[PDB]
Specification:
Four copies of one chain form a homotetramer.
Chain A lengths: L9 E6 L10 E7 L5 E6 L4 H11 L7 E4 L3 H4 L1 H9 L3 E4 L9 H18 L6 H13 L10 H6 L17 H5 L7
Parallel strand pairs in A: 1-4, 4-5
Antiparallel strand pairs in A: 1-2, 2-3
The structure holds ligand ZYN (2 copies), magnesium ion (MG) (4 copies), ammonium ion (2 copies) and zinc ion (ZN) (2 copies).
One zinc ion binds next to helix 5 of chain B.
Chain B binds four DNA strands through helix 3, helix 4, helix 9, strand 12 and strand 13.
Chain lengths: 184, 368, 368, 184
DNA sequence: TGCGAAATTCCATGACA
DNA sequence: ATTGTCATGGAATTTCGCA
DNA sequence: TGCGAAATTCCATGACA
DNA sequence: ATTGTCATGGAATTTCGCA
């Protein structure tokens, strides 16, 4: 069996709804399986259409052999299947109610949610603008298991924006009281 | 003048007037019998005026001015006085072309890493497609990897929007661009500083300086053209295809596609190279590092047999950028303050401002 | 195809597949262990399709297409099949640039007599001066003697008015011009026939062909520019001065002014040459005849190391004249009917019309 | 004394009034003394101004050392003298009532009048258009005394329009009866 | 250890308008 | 304060297959 | 029959937009 | 059925002035 490589598997999933930001409501999340590299695309809906539109941007940079996802409506549609077939991408589904990814990926997806949550409090409506910096963060974050960041694994070089400040990522007591207040 | 010519008539020798010719008087003027014929020797105090009258007939250069003068006159070292004048004719100096070519082009070292240097530029206006007219082209220096973004104008705002999306991936140390309105605006300078990106500008009106991205524009337009043969020029929908196609195209001299230099492995695209199938990613990246450093690098070509290179304190003239009909193609002379490299200089322009300028947009002032 | 590959698997030798490599089967496909690695050998009946898929990714040339294919396949003489395809890609053939330069320029013999050949051309539009915007420039081939006429348009009617005035002096055998609307109109053809003047046209979009007058335009604009430095561009009143000035300016290589070649003696202008003061007119004209025949004539320069010359029945393509944005720069291939000289040809253009065309506006179709 | 040359002397004179042609009434006549070459310029008046305007065309081709003329108003004006001085042209006047030119010139001027008269009858109003051909004629006309035409002496070559037909130049009996009728 | 042919490398040409 | 580039397809050169 | 300097010739460069 | 040209000013070469 051949060693794992970037572009072997993209793990895609939606996150939302979120509060309106520049008319956007969701984030399509793509994580490269081998590298843990993360791409984020804002959408207005978790639809096949918004998925295709967004994946068309990413897949004009690099094409995964396999997309793995849960059995979300947008991913199980025959339009999405047609789309993937055109590009020779195999589609891969976790069985309903039992999502399996990989450790590396699960943890990544965890960081993403927590990191989002942290920044959308205080400014629940400005997240669209922060997606770029959210990604830089995620991708220049050091992996406990591998000696490297996703950037490093993807490109084979150090990044010009390292995030030496491994952050709190937890809600400060000020924010728990104004997060239990925001959703009220 | 009248003193010199007197001593001469009475048969004495004066330095410069050869002894073997007879210098007489006639019609109140000093003459001489030269092989060519009999020419008037005007008094030195008249010579500047004569050279100038000759020159001014059609504002002629050295020989064509001399030949007019020689018709009537002779004196010692005529061309010296002719050249003296050519050097002082404002009109000649700012209107004539150069006849000395630039020294040989530099071939800058390839950026060492992906993201070390971006080159960016706009293409267009193109035929309206979905309300878009331009394309922002961003080319990574080291890899040649290229991103394309359709825009409605070559504006800072559209530049900023596009580059926010791009820099989600990585942030470059340096972005090189030409002096288009979009890239020189203070809004754009801010945007860069905000991110610790250094803005690097081409000397103005010298796109060879953005050669990396310029050359990519050619391929972009070329492929777009082919793909639009016999169809209406609806390019907006092809940008993504073109991007992907170009990023995965081999450069015959490198033996690599820009994608390969960027990632060290093909993605799921047609004809993906499989050679590193059995290497671990880490073995792969190790091999990528070795491939990146060993790429062919061209050398500075031989100088043309009549080139000039700038020297500190030389009088040089900058080419007028958008010269009006029937107006000079050159600015007045100015001085080389600093020689940044053999192809780039700083000049003090008599205003006087410091301008950093390509040698290609200069000629050396003639006749010193 | 399937037959060929069968004989091969069972260990027989087939011409083109070298014997020393082991050809096996795997995943239902014929493979081979080449130094580079293990490549699939597709059946001949699949090869055209493969070459085409590779090529079509970015419409790449020889090597860049081969390198895609080589990633997955091997067969005998791959580039032959690649080239076969490049030669059939309409889009590639009409979009790519040439990489072969034209053969060396001809230096036609100087017309033998004044009035043997006129070259004419328009300059402009210039800044409005007295309601005029253009200049008709008529240059005598042999002498370089030049007449200038201001016009309101580059029209036949204005051409005719000017040339009636000029031909009061003499009538030329031949008038050479480019294919401007003014010179190709039937009204103008009539006007010429009426006078027994032969109209001679440049191959289209190739002003070097009117090089005699073109080059004079440069001097006309250059002197006008100098004379208008620091003044408003009021050129109409200077045309006469410019004319006279140029006609009496020495060509350093000939050692004569066009006036001198035309008349054999200077008129009352500044610095008039006096050398023939003692010759009778008849002695003068006798000397003029000898000067006219002994003028320097340049020779055809060496060919560039990668030029092409047209051959009867060659496939060649004519450059599109005003190509639209994102449209091919070349017309479809066409055939050389006749080689008029090494720089001028007649082609049958698939329409098919006969066009007489400069080699500079052609490239030779690639891959035959 | 040095031999006679083209451009040594231009002999100028007016001819008119004539019948209106394209709004023109006169012809300024310039004959080169040595060659007998003829230039014709149509004017609206025998004025200094029309003379300067016309001579500016000719003198932008070649400049005579001397202009000879009678004491016509237009030629004796101080404007015309200023004009000539600017160009370093010496002005030369025949004494009043006694015009002297040269034989060659007198004969030339004779041919001009007669040739005009011949063509202006039948079409007394179309002469403007014929001035070019009138000149070609005059200039490609063989000189009895010199072995050559003015064209030949000027340019040192044969002309592409020779006038082998040495013409009648006299009024045919049809034209005398319709010339004694036209001016009636 | 040398041949003929295929493969690879060279590199002038031209366009980024 | 900055700096030309590189796809292209014939020709030139090297390598390959065989002996 | 040879020197140093002036004169003349050579010729690449660039523009006819 | 047509086709590059030539002013320009440093450099290269020749000629001149003298001996
Ligand atoms: C708008 C300005 C700054 N600008 C200009 C400009 O100076 N003007 C007047 C249009 C140009 C270009 C820009 O990209 C550009 O941004 C540009 O690419 N080319 C094409 C070209 C020509 C020769 C070459 F060698 C290369 Cl490399 C490219 C023309 C001028
Ligand atoms: C109007 C057409 C026929 N025409 C055209 C033309 O083809 N277009 C499209 C303007 C041109 C010119 C005409 O005179 C002319 O009449 C013309 O001189 N040049 C300048 C030029 C450029 C390079 C050269 F080498 C030379 Cl001797 C001259 C441009 C094109
Ligand atoms: Mg989901
Ligand atoms: Mg550009
Ligand atoms: Mg022209
Ligand atoms: Mg009179
Ligand atoms: N460099
Ligand atoms: N010829
Ligand atoms: Zn001048
Ligand atoms: Zn193609």
């Amino acid at each position: 069996d051949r060693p794992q490589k970037p572009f072997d598997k993209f793990f895609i999933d939606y996150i939302g709804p979120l509060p309106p930001s520049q008319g956007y409501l969701y984030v399509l999340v793509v994580v490269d399986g081998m590298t843990g590299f993360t791409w984020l695309y804002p959408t207005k809906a978790p639809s096949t259409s918004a998925t295709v539109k967004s994946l068309n941007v990413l897949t004009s940079i690099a094409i995964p052999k396999v997309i793995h996802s849960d059995q979300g409506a947008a991913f199980t549609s025959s339009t999405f299947a047609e789309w993937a077939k055109e590009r020779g991408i195999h589609l891969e589904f976790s069985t309903p109610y039992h999502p399996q990814s990989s450790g590396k990926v699960e943890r990544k997806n965890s960081d993403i949610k927590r990191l989002l949550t942290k920044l959308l409090v205080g400014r629940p409506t400005k997240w669209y603008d922060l997606l770029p910096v959210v990604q830089l963060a995620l991708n220049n974050t050091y992996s406990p298991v591998l000696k490297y960041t996703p950037h490093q694994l993807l490109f084979g070089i150090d990044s010009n924006t390292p995030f030496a400040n491994q952050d709190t990522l937890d809600l400060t007591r000020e924010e728990e009281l104004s997060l239990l207040q925001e959703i009220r | 003048l009248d003193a010199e010519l007197d001593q001469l008539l009475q048969g004495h020798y004066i330095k410069g007037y050869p002894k073997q010719y007879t210098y007489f008087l006639e019609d109140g003027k000093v003459k001489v019998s030269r092989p060519e014929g009999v020419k008037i020797i005007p008094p030195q105090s008249d010579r500047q005026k004569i050279v100038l009258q000759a020159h001014n007939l059609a504002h002629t250069g050295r020989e064509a001015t001399l030949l007019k003068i020689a018709n009537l006159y002779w004196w010692p070292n005529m061309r010296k006085d002719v050249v003296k004048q050519l050097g002082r004719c404002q009109q000649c100096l700012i209107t004539n072309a150069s006849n000395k070519a630039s020294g040989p082009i530099l071939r800058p070292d390839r950026p060492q890493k992906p993201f070390d240097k971006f080159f960016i530029d706009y293409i267009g206006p193109l035929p309206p497609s979905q309300g878009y007219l331009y394309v922002l082209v961003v080319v990574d220096g080291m890899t040649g990897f290229t991103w394309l973004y359709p825009t409605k104008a070559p504006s800072t705002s559209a530049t900023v929007k596009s580059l926010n999306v791009l820099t989600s991936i990585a942030i470059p140390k340096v972005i090189h661009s030409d002096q288009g309105a979009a890239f020189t605006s203070s809004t754009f300078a801010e945007w860069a500083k905000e991110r610790g990106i250094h803005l690097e500008f081409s000397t103005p009106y010298h796109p060879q300086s953005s050669g990396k991205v310029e050359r990519k524009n050619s391929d972009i337009k070329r492929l777009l053209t082919k793909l639009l043969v016999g169809r209406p020029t609806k390019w907006y929908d092809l940008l993504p295809v073109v991007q992907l196609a170009l990023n995965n195209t081999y450069s015959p001299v490198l033996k690599y596609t820009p994608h390969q230099l960027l990632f060290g492995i093909d993605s799921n695209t047609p004809f993906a190279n499989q050679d590193t199938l059995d290497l671990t990613r880490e073995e792969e990246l190790s091999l990528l590092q070795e491939i990146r450093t060993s790429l062919y690098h061209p050398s500075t070509p031989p100088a043309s047999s009549r080139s000039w290179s700038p020297v500190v304190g030389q009088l040089v003239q900058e080419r007028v950028a958008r010269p009006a009909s029937l107006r000079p193609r050159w600015h007045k002379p100015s001085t080389v303050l600093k020689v940044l490299n053999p192809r780039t200089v700083v000049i003090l322009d008599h205003l006087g401002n410091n301008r950093t300028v390509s040698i290609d947009n200069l000629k050396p002032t003639s006749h010193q």
